[PDB]
Amino acid sequence: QTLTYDDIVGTGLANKCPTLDDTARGAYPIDSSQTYRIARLCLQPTTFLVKEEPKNKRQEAEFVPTKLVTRETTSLDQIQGELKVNSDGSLTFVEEDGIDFQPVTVQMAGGERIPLLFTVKN
Amino acid sequence: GLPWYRVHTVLINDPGRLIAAHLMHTALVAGWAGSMALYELATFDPSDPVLNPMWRQ
Ligand code: CLA
Ligand code: CLA
Ligand code: CLA
Ligand code: CLA
Ligand code: CLA
Ligand SMILES: CCCCCCCCCCCCCCCC(=O)OC[C@H](COP(=O)(O)OC[C@@H](O)CO)OC(=O)CCCCCCCCCCCCCCC
């Protein structure tokens, strides 16, 4: 429903992106004579995978799963940009602004900590 | 007095202190096992069981 800060504070829901009903499978018409914008974009990572450094003999490095250690501080949100309609018919989002980076530290097996700037800047 | 090589014969007719000696020996052995493992873990590299398995380390 319409929630309030006091409803959410401390629950972990401030880090969750909004969701859409299982029944929202419609379609948004794009009017090529129109100007469009993203008024809010929200990215909520759920898994962080890191390529193990393939040893000298190697064969093929896999993407290994990791433990998040920096808590519910990971989501990108309030991102805005115009949605251009190109003339081949494609759409292009060009980010202007938003909370578009989060530092994140995950930990690999054996204890190596891996920080990263989870981001979509520009 | 007892020679040094006989000090532990005082347990031969002392079942209680024999059990206490045996307990202490068992403690020391269990402690070693724990200490050895912990040293091994502090020094083991698990990144390559192909060319740097444990038996190489
Ligand atoms: C389960 C094993 C076991 C047990 C319970 C005993 C018990 C005993 N032995 Mg026997 N013995 C054993 C194995 C064993 N022995 C073996 C394998 C040998 C051949 C080496 C002997 C040879 C032997 C002799 C020749 C004599 C005894 C004697 C004795 C008695 C007195 C020992 C004493 O006070 O030591 C006192 C010991 C010290 C103060 C210090 C010893 C320091 C040693 C040299 C180095 C320490 C190494 C270190 C602790 C690492 C542990 C060993 C490792 C294998 C785990 C006691 C009843 C004596 C006896 O009969 O008296 C009547 C005696 O004269 N023992
Ligand atoms: C399982 C091992 C063990 C056990 C249960 C006993 C148990 C017993 N001993 Mg024996 N003893 C042992 C090992 C052991 N001893 C060893 C290795 C020696 C050679 C030093 C002796 C020498 C010895 C003598 C001379 C006498 C006994 C006596 C006794 C009795 C009374 C306790 C006592 O006086 O302690 C004394 C012994 C000790 C306190 C052992 C000290 C050994 C230390 C812990 C060595 C550690 C070195 C250090 C930590 C190294 C670390 C690494 C390094 C990098 C620094 C009792 C039956 C007494 C007794 O009743 O006899 C009639 C006695 O007078 N023992
Ligand atoms: C009641 C039946 C019974 C049971 C179950 C045992 C069991 C055992 N006896 Mg024997 N014992 C019995 C009757 C029994 N005994 C009788 C009637 C006598 C003549 C008095 C002896 C005399 C005797 C001697 C002289 C010695 C033993 C030892 C041992 C232990 C050697 C293995 C060991 O320490 O593992 C290693 C231990 C563990 C992995 C953990 C053990 C934890 C268990 C579950 C005990 C928990 C606490 C419990 C309430 C204490 C009572 C123990 C029990 C022996 C009564 C083992 C637990 C030896 C011993 O004590 O070695 C240290 C030893 O020196 N026994
Ligand atoms: C099946 C395995 C087993 C057996 C049978 C024994 C048997 C024995 N151990 Mg134990 N021990 C074991 C495993 C075992 N241990 C393990 C795995 C550890 C952990 C590493 C220990 C740690 C340990 C300690 C710390 C002590 C014992 C002691 C003893 C003896 C106590 C009775 C006694 O007075 O002997 C009389 C003594 C003898 C019969 C001498 C035995 C000679 C053996 C073969 C060693 C030979 C000399 C040795 C290699 C020189 C060391 C050199 C080095 C310091 C440079 C007995 C011989 C105690 C001891 O020796 O008390 C004096 C003692 O202090 N042991
Ligand atoms: C409480 C139970 C318990 C359990 C579940 C374990 C489990 C373990 N121990 Mg620890 N341990 C314990 C008690 C226990 N331990 C105690 C009480 C001590 C003090 C003595 C230790 C001391 C110890 C040492 C020193 C070491 C371990 C190690 C290990 C690991 C390998 C075990 C192994 O290979 O044994 C193998 C055991 C045998 C092959 C025993 C064989 C028994 C012979 C064959 C006797 C047969 C005689 C019998 C009377 C005849 C029966 C007649 C027949 C007709 C039935 C494993 C995680 C090892 C490890 O990795 O440590 C980190 C190691 O090195 N343990
Ligand atoms: C954690 C590990 C702890 C280990 C602690 C130390 C282990 C205990 C001490 C071990 C050393 C033993 C010293 C005992 C030495 C000493 O006590 O010897 C003399 C001693 C005499 O014993 P008796 O029966 O006369 O008893 C008198 C008592 O007062 C002895 O307690 O004999 C024995 O010990 C029997 C074994 C003889 C040993 C003979 C060896 C002598 C060789 C000399 C030649 C050397 C090489 C030269 C030739 C090139």
UniProtKB/Swiss-Prot annotation, chain A:
Coiled-coil boundaries: none
Organism superkingdom: Bacteria
Cell compartments where the protein resides: Cellular thylakoid membrane
Subunit structure of this chain's protein: PSII is composed of 1 copy each of membrane proteins PsbA, PsbB, PsbC, PsbD, PsbE, PsbF, PsbH, PsbI, PsbJ, PsbK, PsbL, PsbM, PsbT, PsbX, PsbY, PsbZ, Psb30/Ycf12, peripheral proteins PsbO, CyanoQ (PsbQ), PsbU, PsbV and a large number of cofactors. It forms dimeric complexes.
Record function comment: One of the extrinsic, lumenal subunits of photosystem II (PSII), which stabilize and protect the oxygen-evolving complex. PSII is a light-driven water plastoquinone oxidoreductase, using light energy to abstract electrons from H(2)O, generating a proton gradient subsequently used for ATP formation. Required for dimerization of PSII and for binding of PsbQ to PSII.
Family in the record: Belongs to the PsbO family.
Name of the protein in question: Photosystem II extrinsic protein O
Source organism (scientific name): Thermosynechococcus vestitus (strain NIES-2133 / IAM M-273 / BP-1)
From Swiss-Prot, chain B:
Membrane side Cytoplasmic: residue ranges: 1-15
Domain of life: Bacteria
Localization per record: Cellular thylakoid membrane
Transmembrane regions listed in the UniProt entry: 16-36
Subunit text: PSII is composed of 1 copy each of membrane proteins PsbA, PsbB, PsbC, PsbD, PsbE, PsbF, PsbH, PsbI, PsbJ, PsbK, PsbL, PsbM, PsbT, PsbX, PsbY, PsbZ, Psb30/Ycf12, peripheral proteins PsbO, CyanoQ (PsbQ), PsbU, PsbV and a large number of cofactors. It forms dimeric complexes. Part of a photosystem II (PSII) assembly intermediate complex PSII-I; crystallized from a strain deleted of psbJ, it forms monomeric PSII before addition of the oxygen evolving complex. PSII-I includes 3 assembly factors not found in mature PSII (Psb27, Psb28 and Psb34).
UniProt record similarity statement: Belongs to the PsbB/PsbC family. PsbB subfamily.
Name of the protein in question: Photosystem II CP47 reaction center protein
Organism encoding this protein: Thermosynechococcus vestitus (strain NIES-2133 / IAM M-273 / BP-1)
Parent sequence residues shown: 2 to 58 of 510
